[PDB]
């Protein structure tokens, strides 16, 4: 799911809606957009 970013990095492919709702934590190459979102989900941005 598409999440809106606090850490609005230069890599705007789309809109402020760039981050994905990642479960628990974040994956390799996925940096914190909105560090915490909901209960057991955080927003991470796949940035190169």
From Swiss-Prot:
Gene Ontology CC annotations of this record: extracellular region; nematocyst
Role this protein plays: Binds specifically to voltage-gated sodium channels (Nav), thereby delaying their inactivation during signal transduction. Is highly toxic to crabs (by intrahemocoelic injection), but without effect upon mice (by intraperitoneal injection).
Protein name: Delta-stichotoxin-She1a
UniProt key word Disulfide bond: yes
Family to which the UniProt record says this protein belongs: Belongs to the sea anemone sodium channel inhibitory toxin family. Type II subfamily.
Superkingdom of this protein's organism: Eukaryota
Gene3D superfamilies: Anthopleurin-A
Disulfide bonds: 3-43, 5-33, 26-44
InterPro entries listed in its UniProt record: Anenome_toxin (IPR000693), Myo_ane_neurotoxin_sf (IPR023355)
Pfam families registered for this protein in UniProt: Toxin_4
Keyword Transmembrane helix included in the entry's annotation: no
Lineage: Eukaryota, Metazoa, Cnidaria, Anthozoa, Hexacorallia
GO molecular-function term, one example from the UniProt record: toxin activity
Sorted UniProt keywords: Disulfide bond, Ion channel impairing toxin, Nematocyst, Neurotoxin, Secreted, Toxin, Voltage-gated sodium channel impairing toxin
